[PDB]
């Protein structure tokens, strides 16, 4: 709507991307993750935090 | 030895003595751990991110 280049704003965080539900990880689990490099390749949603 | 000595004392042969012919009975093996081993001098720290 605003004409931004590469807008970081979504009307709602998508439930599905490419036909699969987007993975959601709590901030506490993501903090303790040691396989973070494999996770970021696919993409995820961070929640349980402000 | 025969005339000027009166009494003699005898004991069992000590096991520490060994004839020169039986020098191979003194062959023995000692094992030294590999020099690539590194011994830690740092204590372990326990933590949690939750």
């Amino acid at each position: 709507r605003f004409g931004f280049r590469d807008s970081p704003f979504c009307t709602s965080l998508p439930r599905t991307i490419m036909g699969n539900d987007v993975r959601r990880i709590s901030y506490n689990v993501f903090s303790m993750m040691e396989d973070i490099d494999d996770v970021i390749s696919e993409g995820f949603i961070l929640y349980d935090a402000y | 030895s025969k005339m000027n000595v009166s009494y003699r004392l005898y004991i069992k042969t000590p096991a520490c003595l060994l004839p020169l012919s039986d020098y191979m009975r003194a062959q023995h093996d000692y094992v030294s751990p590999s020099s690539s081993r590194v011994y830690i001098k740092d204590p372990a720290v326990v933590y949690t991110r939750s």
Side-chain angles (χ1 to χ4, degrees):
Chain A
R1 286 184 297 148
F2 309 100
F4 294 152
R5 186 181 265 284
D6 283 319
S7 163
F9 301 140
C10 302
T11 59
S12 286
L13 277 204
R15 316 187 326 284
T16 63
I17 292 263
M18 299 264 158
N20 260 293
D21 184 1
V22 192
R23 190 191 182 166
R24 326 180 76 105
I25 321 179
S26 96
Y27 199 78
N28 273 321
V29 188
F30 160 87
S31 294
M32 296 279 273
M33 266 186 181
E34 269 185 19
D35 53 31
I36 195 42
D37 49 27
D38 303 279
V39 179
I40 39 185
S41 82
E42 275 282 10
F44 60 101
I45 293 186
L46 265 174
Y47 81 110
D48 289 345
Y50 302 114
Chain B
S1 66
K2 218 153 291 182
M3 293 183 284
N4 297 324
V5 180
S6 323
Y7 293 109
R8 294 221 171 261
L9 204 161
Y10 301 94
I11 61 150
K12 199 187 158 42
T13 312
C16 49
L17 306 171
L18 197 61
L20 183 68
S21 314
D22 316 322
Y23 60 95
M24 279 316 259
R25 305 221 322 164
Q27 186 135 290
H28 290 321
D29 67 23
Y30 295 88
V31 187
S32 317
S34 161
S35 316
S36 74
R37 274 144 96 105
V38 155
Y39 302 105
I40 306 80
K41 334 187 49 75
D42 271 338
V45 192
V46 172
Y47 76 89
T48 189
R49 271 297 306 257
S50 53

